């Protein structure tokens, strides 16, 4: 049951994987399946998540106060802390199209 798989960062952190690789990994997976990867936008990370059967990509910013999707929520000290927050909190607060949580690590 617990601990949830998100605690093993290897289940969702796919390092320097590009967009096309991410889409290949998420193809056919259920809603809420996700990964975290480096972005083509240097200095940034990206979250790729299945929403309504489709893969969406969101930038993760790193700032002096922490990682986050947008001000004033760039509050997390590590990517793991971010992931754990959004495992229980829907991304809809940032965009009404994203009604999903980070529920299922791609490799759990």
């Amino acid at each position: 049951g617990s601990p949830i798989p998100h605690h093993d960062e290897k289940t969702w952190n796919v390092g320097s994987s590009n967009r096309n690789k991410a889409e290949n990994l998420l193809r056919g997976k259920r809603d809420g399946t996700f990964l975290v990867r480096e972005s083509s936008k240097q200095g940034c990370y990206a979250c790729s998540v299945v929403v309504d059967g489709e893969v969406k990509h969101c930038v993760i910013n790193k700032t002096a106060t922490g990682y986050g999707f947008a001000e004033p929520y760039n509050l997390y000290s590590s990517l793991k802390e971010l992931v754990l927050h959004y495992q229980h909190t829907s991304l809809v607060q940032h965009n009404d199209s994203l009604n999903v949580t980070l529920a299922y690590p791609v490799y759990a």
């Binding site: 990206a46 969406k56 990509h57 969101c58 930038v59 940032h94 965009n95 199209s97 994203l98």
Partner: peptide, 5 residues
């Protein structure tokens, strides 16, 4: 990328 506010 999806716009996030």
């Amino acid at each position: 990328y999806v716009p996030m506010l």
